[PDB]
């Protein structure tokens with residue numbers, strides 16, 4: 384388990400780690416990579432209206448690695464992770480992560496577990512056993528850029544209505560893949 388000097392090195396180290404996964408080790412190497420905008424500028428493609436997903440690597444099928452670009456005030460739904468893992472690392476700016484419990488079957492306001500602000504180079508980890516979350520760039524002045532690793536890869540998740548706990552299936556949309564607009 385070595386310090387990744389560049390994004391390219393990080394990806395190689397991740398391929399080795401996923402050749403079989405140890406969550407703590409993945410989190411450790413992600414934290415250890417020091418964000419360098421020169422490494423990831425190609426993928427940092429923004430949209431005026433919502434956050435974007437920019438695929439970086441497909442993990443020899445073991446994981447999806449993508450960079451998400453968040454305009455001021457852009458946020459996600461409250462969502463799950465489709466029986467998979469999500470690791471997220473801040474590359475620039477700040478994101479607020481709000482944790483929620485899984486809702487009961489009754490319609491009810493959703494129950495907010497905790498919140499934290501993630502800052503540059505910090506990470507977070509979530510899975511369905513931990514709960515649900517919402518990720519948002521609450522800044523009025525600064526975009527955020529984050530690095531997200533999903534394993535196994537998945538295309539869809541559920542968004543939850545905070546007022547009721549009811550969920551709707553949604554399909555991930557890609558803004559770009561391998562630097563190319565899609």
Ligand SMILES: [Fe+3]
Pocket residue numbers: 462463464469516
């Ligand atoms: Fe998530």
